[PDB]
Amino acid sequence: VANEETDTATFNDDAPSGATCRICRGEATEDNPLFHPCKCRGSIKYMHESCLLEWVASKNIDISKPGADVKCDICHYPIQFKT
Ligand SMILES: [Zn+2]
Ligand SMILES: [Zn+2]
Numbered sequence: 001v002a003n004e005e006t007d008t009a010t011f012n013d014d015a016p017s018g019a020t021c022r023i024c025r026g027e028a029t030e031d032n033p034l035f036h037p038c039k040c041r042g043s044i045k046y047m048h049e050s051c052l053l054e055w056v057a058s059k060n061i062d063i064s065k066p067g068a069d070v071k072c073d074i075c076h077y078p079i080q081f082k083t
Pocket of ligand 1: 021022023024025026047048051
């Protein structure tokens with residue numbers, strides 16, 4: 001379903017009980033949760049694993065190469081998608 005112009009979301013100034021993405025305000029799942037790859041902080045730090053993979057792609061950077069420095073512009077922290 002994608003005909004609407006709004007959807008349910010969560011916003012707070014501490015660790016949310018139902019945290020949501022910074023790209024599509026979805027709430028963590030059982031296959032694609034949420035996590036903060038960066039130090040943007042607040043309610044726009046979280047992101048789905050998919051959403052991050054599409055974000056760093058829009059930034060015009062090859063995350064599969066050792067010739068990159070894939071990171072933010074809000075807080076400028078190096079983005080993290082593995083540990
Ligand atoms: Zn998302
Ligand atoms: Zn950031």
